[PDB]
């Protein structure tokens, strides 16, 4: 399990979605069906697994699977 695989699993867990649907280019709202409450929870859950603290100025830029992968690096 690498960083990208762990980011993908969490997104699938939080959004209730199959792993094959969590593609690198999917956006949370328009593709995976998230609303704005689900995205705030998804960011929190990313801070939990990777022990980072995402400042909410740049949490608001994390709108796609790849944006989250790239932030965690």
């Amino acid at each position: 399990s690498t960083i990208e695989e762990r980011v993908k699993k969490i997104i699938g867990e939080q959004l209730g979605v199959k792993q094959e649907e969590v593609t690198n280019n999917a956006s949370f709202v328009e593709d995976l069906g998230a609303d704005s409450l689900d995205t705030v929870e998804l960011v929190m859950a990313l801070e939990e697994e990777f022990d980072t603290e995402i400042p909410d100025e740049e949490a608001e830029k994390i709108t796609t699977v790849q944006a989250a992968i790239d932030y965690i690096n």
């Binding site: 328009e30 069906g33 998230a34 609303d35 409450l37 689900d38």
Partner: protein, 309 residues
């Protein structure tokens, strides 16, 4: 002619200071549309939307013409760049007025004046600081109705917006809304979220406001719609002027059936909802209502370009 789409229009709560700033910078028709609204209202509506403060943008008799004008400006960008008309339209609360303008039912300047008055009647019926609306997330409809009945305490509070499975908005007196939200959370609700609206729309407190709105709507010409519009109160596509007027009157103090409205569009063969207004509220609801629907917003220039291609 491949994918059938509808246009949906958001209501109060979706406004923000600076909304549509990128679209206006790309498309001069945005600010030309606001200049028409501004002339009807007597003040510069574009400046209010761009400079605020949010305290002014959030006062309902200014909120409502700001949102209506934003939605009509986005529809005019779409059409100006050659976009074709949607298969049908549905407006969420105040958005029903925006849909009726875009369908050709009500003249734009008439509508601008109309929703300013609607906000004034609503504020008159429930003064500033005395009402509230709250979104109860993840709780069954039997429990919310029970929480509301027990929290009334001689005041008004009831479910008014069926927004999706797992989202019902309640509204009434401020203190009653707080007691109902606390009891909802105590009964297993995930959140009880207060909303940025200055009046409690669609509850019984608005009934006297609806009586005055009926008289104002009688003074306005209604035309037959050129695109079907699904109304909030009955989930019906009315065409006659008297039917449309009556549904707007009743909308002010009866529940908004947004879940059933989106189900109906899907049943008619709509495959994609475009949200024609600021924010992404209606987009975030769509898949929780019908899992096979897709949705996106048309309030940024890049999204507009991609949808037109």
């Amino acid at each position: 002619h491949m994918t059938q789409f509808a246009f949906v229009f958001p209501g109060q709560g979706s406004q923000t200071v600076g909304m549509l700033a990128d679209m206006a910078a790309s498309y001069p028709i945005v600010e030309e549309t606001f200049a028409e609204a501004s002339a009807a209202l007597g003040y510069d509506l574009w400046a209010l939307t761009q400079q605020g403060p949010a305290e002014e943008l959030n006062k309902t008799w200014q909120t409502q013409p700001a949102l209506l004008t934003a939605s009509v400006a986005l529809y005019r960008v779409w059409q100006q760049q050659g976009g074709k008309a949607p298969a049908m339209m549905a407006g969420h609360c105040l958005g029903e007025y925006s849909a009726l303008v875009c369908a050709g039912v009500i003249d734009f300047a008439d509508a601008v004046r109309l929703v300013e008055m609607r906000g004034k009647f609503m504020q008159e019926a429930v003064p500033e600081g005395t009402g509230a609306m709250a979104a109860i997330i993840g709780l069954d409809d039997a429990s919310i109705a029970k929480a509301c009945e027990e929290a009334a305490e001689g005041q008004v509070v009831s479910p008014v917006n069926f927004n999706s499975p797992g989202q019902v908005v309640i509204a009434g007196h401020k203190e009653a809304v707080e007691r109902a939200g606390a009891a909802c959370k105590a009964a297993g609700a995930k959140r009880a979220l207060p909303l940025p609206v200055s009046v409690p729309s669609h509850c019984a407190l608005m009934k006297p406001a609806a009586d005055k709105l009926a008289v104002e709507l009688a003074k306005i010409t209604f035309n037959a719609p050129t695109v079907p519009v699904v109304n909030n109160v009955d989930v019906k596509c009315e065409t006659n002027g008297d039917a449309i007027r009556d549904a707007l009157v009743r909308q002010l103090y009866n529940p908004v059936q947004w879940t059933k409205s989106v189900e109906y569009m899907a049943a008619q063969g709509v495959e994609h909802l475009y949200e024609v207004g600021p924010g992404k509220v209606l987009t975030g609801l769509t898949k929780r209502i019908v899992d096979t629907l897709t949705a996106s917003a048309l309030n940024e220039p890049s999204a507009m370009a991609a949808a037109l291609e």
